[PDB]
Design a protein around this ligand. Structure first.
Ligand SMILES: C[C@@H]1[C@H]([C@H](C=O)[C@@H](C)O)N=C(C(=O)O)[C@@H]1SCC(=O)OC1CCCCC1
Length: 351
C-alpha cells in the first residue's frame, strides 16, 4: 500500500508568491482530510475542497505583503501525510488601478477602441498587454497600441462590424507591471457595436453629411476652422456629448486671456477630439455655415442640427474631415486612433 502524497502550488519558504492565481493543494493515493490557510496573525483564508476530496483551493483574493501558512493532511488506505508550508506574497512598491472605456453594457459606434487607462506610468507595457484578455464575436484580429505612458488602446484593422460583441478582462491584480508596480485590482467590461454611423465634413462643400449604414440621413451646413486655425483633416472618434458645456481653452492648453484663448458656454456639443474639436450649436455663424470657415477649429452647425447630432450620434461613431487646409489629426490625440496606419498600429509600441 502507498502513503498519500501532498502537492501544493506553493513551496515552503517561497517569497514573492504572486497573487494573480489561487493557491491549491492536491492529494494523491488518498484524499484531503484537513486543509487550512491562515495569514500572519491567525485569520483563516476562504477555501473550498472538491467533492472527490482530491483538490483544495483558495476562493477569495489573496493579499499583497502577507505571510501565509498552509496546513494539510491527506489520508489513504496506506496511511497519512501532513505538511506545513509558509510563504510570502509579492511586496509592491506601488499599486496602479486600471480604468476601462467604454462602459459596461454600452452600445457604441464602429470606431470605438478598447481603452485601458492606468493611474500610474507603466514600466512594463508588455506585462500589461499580456494581462488584458479581449474576446470578440465574431472574432476579429486586433492589436494593442499605447497613446501615452498610461493608456493603451486595442482595435481591429478596420471599423468594427455592427453586431459585434466585445469583452475586456483586465486581469492585472497580482501582476508585476514593472519597477515594483502591481495591479490594484482586476476590472472588466463588455460592450456591443451598433449601427455604422459616419459623418463626413467636406471643406469643398462645407456640409457635414451623416450616413447611417451607408444612407444619407442628414446634411448639415457647417463652418469649420478659419484658415489661421483650421480643422485638421482625418478620422475622428465621437466621444462624450453635452446638452451644454463651458469651453475653456486652458483645458486644451491655451490661457483664456491669451490671443487664441477663450471661455464660452455652448449648446449641444459632441466632442470629437481630445484637442478640443466639438460639433456644437453656433447661432452666431448660421450665416457662414455652408459658405465660409469662421471657427477656432470646431464644426459649427445650427442649433437644431447640433441637437440632432447630440440625439442621433453616439460614442464611437465616426466623423471624417476632408479637404481642409489643415494637417491631419494626430494618431495619439485621444480620439485619433484610426489615423495611425494599420502596419504601425499592429506592430505596437510595447518597448
Ligand atoms: C472657442 C469656442 C469653440 C472652440 C472650437 O472651435 C473650442 C471647443 O476649442 N468654438 C467656437 C466657435 O464658435 O468657433 C468658440 S469661440 C469663443 C468665443 O469667444 O466665443 C464667442 C465667439 C463668437 C460670438 C459668440 C461666442
Amino acid at each position: 500500500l502507498l502513503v498519500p502524497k501532498l502537492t501544493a502550488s506553493v513551496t515552503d519558504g517561497a517569497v514573492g508568491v504572486t497573487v494573480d492565481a489561487p493557491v491549491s493543494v492536491t492529494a494523491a493515493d488518498g484524499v484531503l482530510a484537513a486543509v487550512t490557510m491562515v495569514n500572519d496573525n491567525g485569520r483563516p483564508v476562504a477555501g473550498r475542497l472538491s467533492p472527490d476530496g482530491l483538490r483544495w483551493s483558495t476562493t477569495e483574493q489573496l493579499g499583497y505583503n502577507r505571510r501565509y501558512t498552509l496546513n494539510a493532511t491527506a489520508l489513504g488506505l496506506g496511511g497519512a501525510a501532513t505538511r506545513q508550508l509558509t510563504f510570502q506574497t509579492s511586496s509592491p512598491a506601488h499599486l496602479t488601478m486600471p480604468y476601462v472605456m467604454p462602459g459596461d453594457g454600452e452600445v457604441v459606434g464602429v470606431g470605438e477602441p478598447v481603452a485601458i487607462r492606468f493611474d500610474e506610468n507603466i514600466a512594463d507595457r508588455g506585462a500589461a498587454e499580456k494581462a488584458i484578455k479581449i474576446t470578440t464575436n465574431p472574432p476579429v484580429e486586433g492589436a494593442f497600441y499605447w497613446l501615452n505612458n498610461r493608456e493603451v488602446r486595442w482595435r481591429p484593422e478596420h471599423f468594427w462590424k455592427p453586431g459585434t460583441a466585445v469583452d475586456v478582462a483586465v486581469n492585472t491584480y497580482g501582476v508585476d507591471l514593472g519597477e515594483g508596480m502591481f495591479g490594484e485590482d482586476n476590472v472588466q467590461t463588455h460592450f456591443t457595436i451598433g449601427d455604422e454611423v459616419i459623418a463626413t465634413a467636406d471643406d469643398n462643400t462645407k456640409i457635414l453629411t451623416v450616413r447611417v449604414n451607408g444612407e444619407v440621413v442628414k446634411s448639415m451646413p457647417t463652418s469649420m476652422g478659419k484658415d489661421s486655425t483650421p480643422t485638421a483633416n482625418g478620422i475622428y472618434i465621437v466621444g462624450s456629448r453635452y446638452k451644454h458645456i463651458i469651453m475653456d481653452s486652458s483645458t486644451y492648453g491655451v490661457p483664456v486671456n491669451s490671443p487664441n484663448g477663450y471661455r464660452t458656454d455652448v449648446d449641444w456639443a459632441t466632442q470629437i477630439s481630445y484637442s478640443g474639436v466639438f460639433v456644437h450649436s453656433a447661432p452666431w455663424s448660421v450665416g457662414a455655415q455652408g459658405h465660409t470657415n469662421t471657427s477656432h477649429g470646431c464644426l459649427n452647425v445650427s442649433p437644431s442640427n447640433a441637437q440632432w447630432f447630440y440625439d442621433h450620434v453616439k460614442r464611437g461613431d465616426i466623423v471624417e474631415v476632408v479637404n481642409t487646409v489643415g494637417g491631419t489629426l494626430p494618431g495619439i490625440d485621444g480620439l485619433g486612433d484610426w489615423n495611425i496606419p494599420w502596419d504601425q498600429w499592429r506592430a505596437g509600441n510595447a518597448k
